[PDB]
Design a protein around this ligand. Structure first.
Ligand SMILES: [Zn+2]
Lengths: 92, 6
């Protein structure tokens, strides 16, 4: 099951980052590739697959790492990064 | 980052 099918494609996710705040220390490409799209306020994003949302990004944050840290069971996460990556993150 | 509370 996919929470948000209109956001399945990387291209559609990138579009939502049109008004991504430049003050935020994480680039839209990286968020889009990790399955996130912009909800439209501040720095809130959601995964099109698991629907997990993240906010308050900090300098050095890695979208895939945070994805695996907070939502280790996302099917998109597992499909893109592999179970070993997830387990490895969880093991920190 | 942190989860958006639901
Ligand atoms: Zn996800």
């Amino acid at each position: 099951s996919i929470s948000n099918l209109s956001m399945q494609t990387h291209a559609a996710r990138m579009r939502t980052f049109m008004y991504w705040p430049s003050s935020v220390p994480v680039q839209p490409e990286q968020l889009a590739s990790a399955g996130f799209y912009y909800v439209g306020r501040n720095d809130d994003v959601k995964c099109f697959c698991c629907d997990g949302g993240l906010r308050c990004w900090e300098s050095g944050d890695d979208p895939w790492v945070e994805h695996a840290k907070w939502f280790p069971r996302c099917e998109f996460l597992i499909r893109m990064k592999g179970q070993e990556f997830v387990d490895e993150i969880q093991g920190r | 980052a942190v989860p958006i509370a639901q």
